[PDB]
Design a protein around this ligand. Structure first.
Ligand code: BCL
Ligand code: BCL
Ligand code: BCL
Ligand code: BCL
Ligand code: BPH
Ligand code: BPH
Ligand code: U10
Ligand code: SPO
Ligand code: UQ2
Ligand code: LDA
Ligand code: LDA
Ligand code: LDA
Ligand code: LDA
Ligand code: LDA
Ligand code: LDA
Ligand code: LDA
Ligand code: FE
Lengths: 302, 280, 240
């Protein structure tokens, strides 16, 4: 049995890594957290530090405010009974206002005001967290890729909960807060729109979603195969290709007749992934605003 | 026809079968025994599909479809025009896939690398063989498998799914979808991390793995650079494992409406009968 | 109609993107070559991208790619056939010559440096205060080669400081000198470390290093190359 580098055989620890200063305001970093020998068989053992700071707190508090707004409604739905709460946990739902209130903020708590409130806390939690991904990069001198990519996820989420409802004319179009209820919403959306399998954008989304599983299986597996030549140290291999980058590229060139670079691969990655939610969001945004029935649309190919 | 660094690697050796017989390239492509096997299987397979296309009366790629034996053939053979061609194309497809992984193994040996890629590929092959071989055999008929056609395969997805109501409620399907989504998230982020290090702000120098910092700053953890490649691998393979679990069990150990499976939790004696809430 | 416009545009944008990605990935190993080193006639439909310049930190310069591609080392291989596309037979000892699965690249003959400009990889003995934190400690274990003979013993672990992980086992040979063996190519068992890539007699042949408390990218590549090449080239003496 040859060693496969899925798990480490020996962990080593030294001083808590406090990381790079650059332009970070160190006043705002916690200190380290514990060290998890468990995590350490697979990845890094060190937890923390994290970086708090103004926007962080806004986000974190605001996010709890959302989580708690939903949970209150759930207890309420359980008539305050613990054993019921636990029982019906995946069945509770914080539903948006009825079609009748339109886009008004004037619906009763018990039928929408609470949804809108919870949605308000979510909106600030996500955007402040976005801005966080940008600023943590800024302070470190780093590129803005993570914030751009996060924008791609944000797009789908904005379309589902906010852009589409507005265009459509009402908050009733939006997604409820529930484990089971959200899946029902999902099913019903497709049903009511002629089956999303007829939306060229849904189908693109799938190709990317699958593609990401394929790409990362491939990438991950490759780096692991060429890790006995230091493959995982991708940035130095970018600055100074080693036999790792080379055997990596040549495996694929000999297999399928073309190949990546140790930096290019990462551009394949970022795009495979971002394109999932990119197409996805267009696909949804179009639905009902412009196309009522993807089967019907599909019949006139236009 | 060669990458600037390629020649030092194009040495003899590593083949699994044939010694030096098929040890050679054609353009960038390595051949090998299993490159030959692959060609023979993929070529036959395509020829049989084009034939099945003639028997069906179309050349449109949006229409061409090869359906399996209808349900009343069980697990025997069917006349070529009535699911026999599918049966032979499926033998071809499997031949082509396995050959391709074994050709991958052969490349690995020439290049002195690890076998991780063909290992990873084997999970996809297993997903495929679950849908077209394992599930049908356990269910008693080839006609349970999906047909080979761009849109007709999608019909099979929907009709199989709705046989159990909203397929969302398949518990394995949920775990699987979780891996898919998570894996996409890890792809987005690994890609963006590395790129933001290699491509820093205008004029600044290339950053370093110390990256760990950015992520710790952001969420209080960083898995590391060996770690993330281990992750993507695990995430995406796990999505496909659960994908295959979620279908190996459907139509076999569970065949009613997936939503109803969840009743075992609600119906637990300690709370089954307490009133209030959605199921009280 | 608006959905038709959108899907047609997307396919356009996506062709653009495949172009952009394909060319981006052409920044190394291009232009293509013939087996003799000269510019192959057919390069395919993708042109090389405009160059780009990476600023290397710690005054190590820049890299600019695409740029002139050379091996910067002899390649002890020769043709085995009169036409394109065959294997190139090793002209000497492939292990020693660094060809095939023994290949190394000629990277910079300095050590990769951490984000603070310090050497990324130290022997543990010289990294304060790093210690084995879990799993069997290999230091002290005999090292066994694929001929099932003892080839030496583990005298330290070279560790990656910024990422806190094991990268090599420093191994002492019959004659008192050490070698680096990659972490990824050894099996730490409980009474031994097992090295399947090499038979015992092939250990002296591992590339040495010049200062005993650091390793250079060049040296790393030669060690890793040499050890991997063992799987193909040691197969005569193995055995398990
Ligand atoms: C894509 C089209 C549909 C969709 C349909 C699907 C389908 C189908 C499935 C899910 C499932 C997931 N969906 Mg959904 N769902 C979408 C909308 C989203 C949104 C959102 C837009 O904000 C959220 C938060 C979720 C979150 C949920 C999770 C419970 C689950 C796993 C997510 C994941 O793997 O993330 C990536 C993982 C992370 C590391 C980040 C997220 C962490 C998760 C676990 C926490 C978020 C929810 C949390 C509040 C639940 C805990 C409450 C209780 C105390 C247990 N969905 C839209 C509307 N979703 C799956 C499931 O198994 O549900 C039962 C499932 O089968
Ligand atoms: C996995 C679960 C279901 C199913 C779920 C669905 C759903 C749902 C969708 C698809 C869609 C796709 N499916 Mg399907 N799919 C099935 C399994 C298959 C199998 C197989 C097992 O052999 C194949 C080849 C395909 C391939 C196809 C593609 C036509 C399309 C996009 C794939 C993709 O981006 O992958 C990701 C991988 C890559 C990016 C690699 C690219 C490889 C692709 C492009 C090769 C396609 C070859 C195709 C023309 C077949 C011709 C064979 C040749 C003659 C040899 N599916 C099973 C039965 N599939 C989507 C679609 O829009 O179709 C209309 C879609 O919405
Ligand atoms: C039966 C139901 C319908 C269905 C209709 C739906 C609907 C409706 C939708 C999809 C969507 C998609 N469908 Mg579909 N789908 C069909 C069945 C298929 C099948 C199949 C048959 O095999 C597959 C593979 C898919 C594939 C998928 C995905 C490719 C795609 C969403 C991608 C995504 O990453 O979302 C997950 C990502 C997000 C939702 C964004 C995450 C947003 C961020 C901001 C999250 C914040 C989290 C935070 C607030 C919570 C913190 C928790 C933490 C623990 C801290 N569908 C059938 C036909 N599908 C979506 C789509 O894009 O369609 C075009 C969508 O709206
Ligand atoms: C209305 C329909 C139902 C439903 C129907 C079911 C059914 C039925 C199935 C799934 C399965 C899938 N569903 Mg569903 N499911 C739906 C809701 C969704 C939603 C959603 C957001 O709503 C999502 C995200 C998913 C996601 C999941 C995945 C877990 C799984 C598909 C991936 C896979 O198995 O690949 C695995 C990979 C493969 C099989 C591909 C293998 C490819 C290799 C081996 C060969 C290709 C080489 C060659 C042909 C290429 C050509 C050569 C060229 C040169 C390229 N489902 C709705 C509710 N779902 C499928 C599954 O789990 O299958 C196991 C499945 O059968
Ligand atoms: C490209 C498409 C893929 C994608 C990518 C993506 N997502 C993004 C980004 C990227 C590029 C990241 O920058 C960002 C991120 O920060 O990740 C680390 C993120 C992110 N994607 C996330 C979720 C997510 N994204 C989705 C996935 C996807 N995003 C797609 C598959 C999914 C799915 C599939 O639904 C999930 C649910 C988060 C991990 C993060 C967004 C962070 C955020 O907006 O949160 C702000 C608000 C909170 C912190 C709310 C907390 C509520 C908790 C339930 C409470 C419990 C924990 C608590 C915080 C502990 C505190 C304890 C105290 C008492 C002290
Ligand atoms: C295991 C996790 C994921 C994964 C990983 C994976 N895929 C793999 C491998 C791995 C590691 C690669 O090494 C390998 C590769 O060569 O990389 C490009 C590959 C590969 N995965 C591929 C496709 C693929 N992977 C899939 C996805 C996945 N692969 C999972 C998500 C799917 C999805 C998601 O739908 C598809 C479409 C190819 C790009 C490649 C395999 C190429 C190959 O085996 O070629 C040999 C044979 C041929 C060239 C064609 C044979 C033709 C047949 C004889 C006839 C066709 C029959 C077929 C059944 C008809 C289908 C019709 C459809 C409309 C349904
Ligand atoms: C850091 O490392 C890394 C690299 O390197 C530096 C890499 O390159 C790669 C490789 C990854 C890429 C190049 C990114 C782009 C990849 C995708 C989006 C995946 C999708 C793949 C395709 C769309 C094309 C695959 C199609 C195939 C397999 C080509 C089929 C061609 C034929 C004609 C085959 C027929 C049979 C053959 C060739 C056998 C030979 C026999 C004869 C001809 C006789 C990875 C993963 C990696 O991480
Ligand atoms: C144990 O008990 C306690 C109470 C302590 C804690 C437990 C609480 C529990 C159990 C809560 C569980 C929460 C759940 C299940 C939430 C998960 C729901 C899901 C699956 C969410 C998925 C869909 C979300 C989407 C797509 C919504 C997007 C929202 C937006 C885009 C923002 C909307 C913006 C609006 C409407 C505000 C408008 C106002 C202005 C002007 C900005
Ligand atoms: C850029 O790649 C990424 C890493 O960043 C370096 C991560 O590490 C993780 C997060 C890993 C896990 C399993 C967290 C569990 C550990 C804790 C905090 C208890 C993800 C998803 C990721 O995509
Ligand atoms: C999304 C991954 C979740 C990562 C959470 C890890 C948090 C680490 C907390 C560090 C702070 C601990 N403390 C109190 C000792 O400072
Ligand atoms: C996502 C992180 C989860 C980490 C859990 C991994 C535990 C695996 C332990 C592997 C066993 C190590 N051992 C003893 C063989 O050396
Ligand atoms: C990062 C680029 C990789 C390319 C992935 C594109 C695959 C094409 C799949 C066809 C989708 C067909 N349709 C009708 C749903 O649009
Ligand atoms: C989305 C599938 C597209 C099918 C085309 C196959 C792409 C493989 C790359 C071709 C390699 C070019 N080469 C070396 C033969 O000239
Ligand atoms: C979605 C993936 C797209 C596959 C085809 C993209 C590149 C095809 C191969 C390029 C040709 C390789 N070449 C000639 C530069 O060596
Ligand atoms: C069994 C599935 C049918 C195979 C179809 C042949 C592959 C062609 C790819 C789809 C593109 C359609 N086209 C050429 C009309 O644009
Ligand atoms: C963020 C990386 C950690 C993986 C989280 C994936 C969420 C889905 C939960 C599936 C876990 C079930 N499992 C495999 C332990 O049985
Ligand atoms: Fe990588």
């Amino acid at each position: 049995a040859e060693y496969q580098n899925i798990f480490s055989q020996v962990q080593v620890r030294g001083p808590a890594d406090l990381g790079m200063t650059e332009d970070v305001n160190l006043a705002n970093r916690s200190g380290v957290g514990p060290f998890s020998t468990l995590l350490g068989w697979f990845g890094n053992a060190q937890l923390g530090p994290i970086y708090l700071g103004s926007l962080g707190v806004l986000s974190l508090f605001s996010g709890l405010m959302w989580f708690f707004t939903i949970g209150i409604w759930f207890w309420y739905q359980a008539g305050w009974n613990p054993a019921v709460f636990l029982r019906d946990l995946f069945f509770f739902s914080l539903e948006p206002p009825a079609p009748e209130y339109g886009l008004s903020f004037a619906a009763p708590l018990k039928e929408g005001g609470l949804w809108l409130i919870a949605s308000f806390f979510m909106f600030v939690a996500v955007w402040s967290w976005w801005g966080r991904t940008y600023l943590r990069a800024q302070a470190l001198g780093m590129g803005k890729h993570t914030a751009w990519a996060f924008l791609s996820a944000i797009w789908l989420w904005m379309v589902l909960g906010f852009i589409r409802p507005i265009l459509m004319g009402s908050w009733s179009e939006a997604v409820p807060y529930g484990i089971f209820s959200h899946l029902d919403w999902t099913n019903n959306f497709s049903l009511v729109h002629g089956n999303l399998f007829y939306n060229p954008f849904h189908g693109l989304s799938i190709a990317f979603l699958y593609g990401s599983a394929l790409l990362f299986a491939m990438h991950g597996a490759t780096i692991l195969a060429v890790s006995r030549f230091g493959g995982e140290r991708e940035l130095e291999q970018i600055a100074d290709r080693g036999t790792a980058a080379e055997r990596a590229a040549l495996f694929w060139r000999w297999t399928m007749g073309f190949n990546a670079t140790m930096e290019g691969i990462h551009r394949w990655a970022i795009w495979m992934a971002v394109l999932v939610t990119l197409t996805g969001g267009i696909g949804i945004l179009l639905s009902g605003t412009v196309v009522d029935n993807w089967y019907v649309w599909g019949q006139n190919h236009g | 026809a060669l990458l600037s660094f390629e020649r030092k690697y194009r040495v003899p050796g590593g083949t699994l079968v044939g010694g030096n017989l098929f040890d050679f390239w054609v353009g960038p492509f390595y051949v090998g025994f299993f490159g030959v096997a692959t060609f023979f299987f993929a070529a036959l397979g395509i020829i049989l599909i084009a034939w099945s296309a003639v028997l069906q009366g179309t050349w449109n790629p949006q229409l061409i479809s090869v359906y399996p034996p209808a349900l009343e053939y069980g697990l025997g053979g069917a006349p070529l025009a009535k699911g026999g061609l599918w049966q032979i194309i499926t033998i071809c497809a499997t031949g082509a896939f396995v050959s391709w992984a074994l050709r991958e193994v052969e490349i690995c040996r020439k290049l002195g690398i690890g076998y991780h890629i063909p290992f990873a590929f084997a999970f996809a092959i297993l997903a495929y063989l679950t849908l077209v071989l394992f599930r049908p055999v356990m269910m008693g008929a080839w006609g349970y498998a999906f047909p080979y056609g761009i849109w007709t395969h999608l019909d099979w997805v929907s009709n199989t799914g709705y046989t159990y109501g909203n397929f969302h409620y398949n518990p394995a399907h949920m775990i699987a979808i979780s891996f898919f989504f998570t894996n996409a998230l890890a792809l987005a982020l690994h890609g963006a991390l590395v790129l933001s290090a290699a491509n820093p702000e205008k004029g600044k120098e290339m950053r370093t793995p110390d990256e760990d910092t950015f992520f710790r700053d952001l969420v209080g953890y960083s898995i590391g650079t060996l770690g993330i490649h281990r992750l993507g691998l695990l995430l995406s393979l796990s999505a496909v494992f659960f994908s295959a679990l979620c279908m190996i069990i459907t139509g076999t150990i569970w065949f009613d409406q997936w939503v109803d499976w969840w009743q075992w939790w609600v119906k637990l004696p300690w709370w089954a009968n307490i009133p209030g809430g959605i199921n009280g | 109609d608006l959905a038709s416009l959108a899907i047609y545009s997307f396919w356009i944008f996506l062709a653009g993107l495949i172009y952009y990605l394909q060319t981006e990935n052409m920044r190394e190993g291009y232009p293509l070559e013939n087996e003799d080193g000269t510019p192959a006639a057919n390069q395919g439909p993708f042109p090389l991208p405009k160059p780009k310049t990476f600023i290397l930190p710690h005054g190590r310069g820049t890299l600019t790619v695409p740029g002139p591609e050379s091996e910067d080392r002899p390649i002890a291989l020769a043709r085995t056939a009169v036409s394109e596309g065959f294997p190139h037979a090793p002209t000497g000892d492939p292990m020693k010559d660094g060809v095939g699965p023994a290949s190394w690249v000629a990277r910079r003959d300095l050590p990769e440096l951490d984000g603070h400009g310090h050497n990324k990889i130290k022997p543990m003995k010289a990294a304060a205060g790093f210690h084995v934190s879990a799993g069997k400690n290999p230091i002290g274990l005999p090292v066994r080669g694929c001929d099932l003979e003892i080839a030496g013993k583990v005298v330290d672990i070279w560790v990656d400081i910024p990422e806190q992980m094991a990268r090599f086992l420093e191994v002492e040979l019959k004659d008192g000198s050490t070698r680096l063996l990659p972490m990824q190519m050894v099996k730490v068992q409980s009474n031994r470390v097992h090295v399947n890539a090499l038979s015992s007699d092939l250990f002296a042949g591992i590339p040495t290093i010049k200062s005993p408390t650091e390793v250079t990218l060049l040296e790393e590549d030669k060690i890793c190359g040499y050890v991997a090449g063992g799987l193909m080239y040691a197969a005569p003496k193995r055995k398990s």
